[PDB]
Amino acid sequence: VLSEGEWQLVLHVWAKVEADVAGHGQDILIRLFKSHPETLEKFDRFKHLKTEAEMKASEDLKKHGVTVLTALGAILKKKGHHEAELKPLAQSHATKHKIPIKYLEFISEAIIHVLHSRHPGDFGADAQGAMNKALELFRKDIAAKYKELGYQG
Ligand code: HEM
């Protein structure tokens, strides 16, 4: 489980992300798409983007980054008591968007990398370990909903 001190590390760095939600969101999605190109194919909205420069110039991509980080922040601020928020997300990602759990692992790695690049002083090893645990909890709870619906695999 996460301890109170671990949650405090997570939420202290998250308060810094919220001073620039759009910029963080852009960086995280670009990192995902460049490191794991198969993920771009799940987005009919974005699959025309071929270069990093094109990704950086897209306002629609920046808008989706804000949607993703706003939803994640709402989950993290519940400190584990996130059923109401998480259940609808799991349902749409399993049955409509068809996102494998592995791609949730990939985006979690992208989040960690961008937080370390933008906030080294508040993102030392202790904070990294707490954020990894928070994102593991997120994935574990989505995976349990996927299995109920027959999408875990
Ligand atoms: C931190 C993880 C993630 C969060 C919090 C998140 C959140 C959201 C939210 C709030 C929406 C809009 C409402 C909905 O459709 O449920 C959405 C849409 C979507 N997400 Fe996720 N997402 C995450 C990861 C991913 C990943 C890894 C992929 C693909 C590789 C993905 C693919 C999509 C798609 C295709 C849509 C629909 C976009 C559109 O065409 O409007 N998501 N996501």
Swiss-Prot record:
It catalyses: Fe(III)-heme b-[protein] + nitric oxide + H2O = Fe(II)-heme b-[protein] + nitrite + 2 H(+); H2O2 + AH2 = A + 2 H2O. It is found in: Cytoplasm, Sarcoplasm. GO terms for molecular function: heme binding; metal ion binding; nitrite reductase activity; oxygen binding; oxygen carrier activity; peroxidase activity. Its EC number is 1.7.-.-, 1.11.1.-. Belongs to the globin family. PANTHER family: MYOGLOBIN. The modification Phosphothreonine is found at residue 67. Keywords: Cytoplasm, Heme, Iron, Metal-binding, Muscle protein, Oxidoreductase, Oxygen transport, Phosphoprotein, Transport. One of its GO terms (biological process) is removal of superoxide radicals. GO terms for cellular component: extracellular exosome; sarcoplasm. The gene is MB. Monomeric heme protein which primary function is to store oxygen and facilitate its diffusion within muscle tissues. Reversibly binds oxygen through a pentacoordinated heme iron and enables its timely and efficient release as needed during periods of heightened demand. Depending on the oxidative conditions of tissues and cells, and in addition to its ability to bind oxygen, it also has a nitrite reductase activity whereby it regulates the production of bioactive nitric oxide. The modification Phosphoserine is found at residue 3. It comes from the Eukaryota. The keyword Transport applies. Pfam families: Globin. InterPro entries: Globin, Globin-like_sf, Myoglobin. Heme b binds at residue 93. Residues 1-147 form the Globin domain. Nitrite binds at residue 64. Monomeric. This is Myoglobin. It comes from Physeter macrocephalus. O2 binds at residue 64.
